[PDB]
Amino acid sequence: LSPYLQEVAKRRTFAIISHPDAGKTTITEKVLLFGQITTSVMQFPYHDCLVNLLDTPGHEDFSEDTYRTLTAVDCCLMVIDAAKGVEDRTRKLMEVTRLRDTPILTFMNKLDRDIRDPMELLDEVENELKIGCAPITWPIGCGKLFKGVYHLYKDETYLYQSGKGHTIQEVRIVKGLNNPDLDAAVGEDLAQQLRDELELVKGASNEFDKELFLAGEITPVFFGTALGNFGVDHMLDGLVEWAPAPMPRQTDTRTVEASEDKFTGFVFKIQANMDPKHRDRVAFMRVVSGKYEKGMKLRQVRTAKDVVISDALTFMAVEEAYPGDILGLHNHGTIQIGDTFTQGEMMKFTGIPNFAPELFRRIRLKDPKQLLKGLVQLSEEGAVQVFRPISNNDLIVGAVGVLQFDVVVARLKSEYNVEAVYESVNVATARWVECADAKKFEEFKRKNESQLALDGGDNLAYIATSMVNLRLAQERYPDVQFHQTREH
């Protein structure tokens, strides 16, 4: 209990992972009224804690930076549409999460409307996402018949009042599971069905365990409706109680704890499109340790220069930050994704990655050609990834979300003189390739040369025609490693 450590102990940093249309926007909004650009990251008080919520843009905004945002959090909330179950992007974002086995909290949403069998929703999570479920609450009816939820550990029933949503409902609680007031509130039909279903839950599901939760191996499961603002506070109570305070982060040199003074942090995201009053392209940095104050002098390790940061975007609940918080650095071409910042100590954080792009095309000028110089530089920042096959001169751009393609053409025109045009190519993914046996490694290069390419950072990567072709290369050259991810 020493003022600075007090501020570290009470912070909780998380982001939502969800499929588009599942309810991130609705539940984020409701989360904020329980706490009483800025949308990027929002800090609010809840109970005795200070909670940092990072946006994970999933619509037209979707990009590789959405994935990288998850590297900068210590906890995620998986929001599932309880009518649709586990969807594609749900699976993709959990995938990203397994890089650090980040703890997950689950919120089954849209209980206003009819849903899939809740026991099946649990099943779906376990068999598809490889994580145990632990129901904390359990729904009592659904649709027009949604009456509320039951807490398995507090032995009580929260009662749902329809048509609230834009306020915080009155909390109404019946205490016994076997209290006849539960039957009077909900009907004996749904009260008996609760009791029978809890029996199946005990027989086929898992008790909550804080240890496994922190190891990324179970998740508490909450049921509610974000539109009607019910059960969101139930999930925030788990968040506060169970999610970690600012966790450590690994470096090339050592493990950095948040309990250290000395400011320390890394950049995980750079805003696409420069608007504000200039080209700020705000670089978002996660504070790993120490306190940022306004006039402070930091070390940009990449360039080995001292930078005074007088203006720094802050997302308060004035102009300070503690570990767990996010900072927006003003950037005019000097910051890059993965840039570490300290107060002199020269080391590099080692979590911030480059994911296998999910979308590809060939870039090309309608002539002639410093287009290469421009893609390599955009690649050094966050903008995109480029691939230069060994056997030819083509340039292949690799994005995660379509938006990135448009951004490259614009920035190529403005910051470099080039006018660039896209062309379809046959590429389904890439994998960075690696082999400690020089003899087997060169035999692999020789026999697969037509599918091999170089990064904008000179890392060798197999460019796969289809996933079937990737599985073939993998199984025929088992001594070679195919990585879906690499350090940026």
Cα–Cα distance list, 278 to 262, 295, 327, 366, 458 (Å): 31, 21, 18, 31, 32
CB 421, min distance to ligand GDP, A = 32
Identify which of 357, 358, 355, 359 has the alpha carbon closest to the alpha carbon of residue 424: 359
Nearer to ligand GDP, 24 or 330 (CB): 24
**Residue closer to ligand GDP, measured from CB, 24 or 486:** 24
Q: State whether the Cα torsion 438-440-441-447 is positive or negative.
A: positive
Closer residue to ligand GDP, CB minimum distance, 84 or 302: 84
| Distance in Å, CB of 50 to ligand GDP, minimum | 24
- Per the CB < 8 A criterion, the answer to whether 50 and 130 are in contact is no
Which residues are at the interface with ligand GDP (CB under 6 A)?
18, 20-26, 109-110, 112-113, 225-227
Which run of H or of E encompasses 238?
helix 232-242
* Residue 267 parent element (H or E): strand 264-270
Closer by beta carbon to ligand GDP, 112 or else 325:
112
Kindly state the smallest distance separating residue 116's Cβ from ligand GDP, in Å: 14
For ligand GDP, which is the closer residue by CB, 18 or 404? 18
Q: What is the closest distance, in whole angstroms, from the C-beta atom of residue 34 to ligand GDP in the complex?
A: 15
Instruction: Kindly state the smallest distance separating residue 121's Cβ from ligand GDP, in Å.
Output: 15
Residues 6 or more apart in contact with residue 76 via CB below 8 angstroms: 14, 15, 16, 17, 70, 93, 97, 102, 103, 104, 105
- Nearest C-alpha neighbor of 488 from the set 363, 341, 383, 360: 383
Closest separation in Å from C-beta 27 to ligand GDP:
7
Q: Which is nearer to ligand GDP, 35 or 457 (CB)?
A: 35
DSSP state of 251: B
201, two tokens: 């839950």
Q: By C-beta, is 109 or 429 nearer to ligand GDP?
A: 109
Question: Which residues fall in the annotated binding site for GTP?
Answer: 18-25, 55-59, 109-112
Classify residue 47 by its DSSP letter. Answer: T
Alpha helices for 438-488 (secondary structure H): 438-447, 467-476
- Going by DSSP bridges, is the β-strand pair 320-321/292-293 parallel, antiparallel, or unpaired? antiparallel
Buried/exposed code over 67-80 (b: 16+ C-beta within 10 A; e: otherwise): bbbbbbbbbbbbbb
CB-wise, 13 or 26, nearer to ligand GDP? 26
Q: List 150's β-bridge partners, or say none.
A: 138, 157
Report, in Å, the least distance between residue 428 CB and ligand GDP. Answer: 26
Please, which residue, 109 or 404, has the CB nearer to ligand GDP?
A: 109
Residue ranges with strand state E in 335-455 = 340-342, 353-355, 359-365, 385-389, 395-399, 420-423, 429-434, 452-454
**Integer Cα distance of 266 and 271 in angstroms:** 15
For the bound state, the minimum distance from the C-beta of residue 19 to ligand GDP, rounded and expressed in Å, comes to 7
Q: From the CB of 423, what's the least distance to ligand GDP, in Å?
A: 32
Residues annotated as binding site? 18-25, 55-59, 109-112
Distances in whole angstroms, Cα of residue 293 to Cα of each of 247, 263, 440, 445: 21, 10, 53, 51
